[PDB]
Each structure stands twice: as structure tokens, then as C-alpha cells.
Write a protein that binds this ligand. Structure first.
Ligand SMILES: Cc1cccc(CN=[N+]=[N-])c1
Length: 162
């Protein structure tokens, strides 16, 4: 297991524009196109991202290319964030993957309310962190995925992904 295999499990792979769990137009491996309800605005973003007129459809190679870009930008983002970087750098490689996964799903603004979980993770209070992480909109809206990510934070193993 690694961050790519992990996010591939959590995000799936779809080659035609679809709506994610939040009802937002998305493609590939969880590549968010826009929060706009206009399918045409979504198609424009797609074409912009890929560099050709896609008419709502991409190839597996194209999906994987966006995925590489999206994972890279998630990591680089964490590193640029004064609140996130010290916690990230305190973690082992497996728990780092959990962090990338959560940021990928929620965004940096997404995790602004996780100050208390972040502190417990920095302290390596793993069970307490895991309890605190689940007290969230995130957990309630996507519990199956959040359970896997939280188990990864709790244990530093890949047990939840097999
Ligand atoms: C950068 C980073 C480190 C640890 C956890 C998370 C996800 N949000 N929380 N808690 C992000």
C-alpha cells in the first residue's frame, strides 16, 4: 500500500463526469472540477485541465495524470501551511498518508476545524486523536471512508486497506 493505492480505493475511477458525495462535478480519481451546479462550467474546467475538448470524457492515462498532479499539490499544500506542516513532519510515513488522504478529500479550509485532532496527533495520543477525529461532519457524511482513514491515524498500519 501507498498513498496512490489508498486514494484509488477511497476515490474510485470514473472516466465520465460524475457528481461526488457532495454533489459536485468530478472526474477520474476524485478530481473535483467545480462546485458550480452548471455542467457546462464543469466541462470547461475539464477541457482546461486536460488541454483538449473532452466533451465530458477522459482516458485512464488522463485520469492518472490529474491524480498525480492532485496528490502532489495536496502534499505541497500541507508543507506550505504553517498549522499543518509541523504535525505532518511529526508523523511516520503511514500516518502521513492518512493526512494526505484527508486533505485531498476536504481541502485545507476543510481541516481548519481540526485544531484539537491536530494537537492530539502531534502528541501521538493515538486513541484520543481517533475519538476526536470522528466527532465531525466529515465522519458523519462519509463514515466508511473516515473509519479507514481514522484507523490509519490510530495504528500507523494499513490494516483498514488490506
Ligand atoms: C497536514 C495534516 C496533518 C495531520 C492531519 C491532517 C488532516 N486533518 N486533521 N486533523 C492534515
Amino acid at each position: 500500500m501507498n498513498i496512490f493505492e489508498m486514494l484509488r480505493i477511497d476515490e474510485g475511477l470514473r472516466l465520465k463526469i460524475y457528481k461526488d458525495t457532495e454533489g459536485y462535478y468530478t472526474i477520474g480519481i476524485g478530481h473535483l472540477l467545480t462546485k458550480s451546479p452548471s455542467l457546462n462550467a464543469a466541462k470547461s474546467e475539464l477541457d482546461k485541465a486536460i488541454g483538449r475538448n473532452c466533451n465530458g470524457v477522459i482516458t485512464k492515462d488522463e485520469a492518472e495524470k490529474l491524480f498525480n498532479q492532485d496528490v502532489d499539490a495536496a502534499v505541497r499544500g500541507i508543507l506550505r501551511n504553517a498549522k499543518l506542516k509541523p504535525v505532518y513532519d511529526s508523523l511516520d510515513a503511514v500516518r502521513r498518508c492518512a493526512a494526505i488522504n484527508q486533505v485531498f478529500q476536504m481541502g485545507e479550509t476543510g481541516v481548519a476545524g481540526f485544531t484539537n485532532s491536530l494537537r492530539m496527533l502531534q502528541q501521538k495520543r493515538w486513541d484520543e486523536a481517533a475519538v476526536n477525529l470522528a466527532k465531525s461532519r466529515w465522519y458523519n457524511q462519509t463514515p466508511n471512508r473516515a473509519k479507514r482513514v481514522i484507523t490509519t491515524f490510530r495504528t500507523g498500519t494499513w490494516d483498514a486497506y488490506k
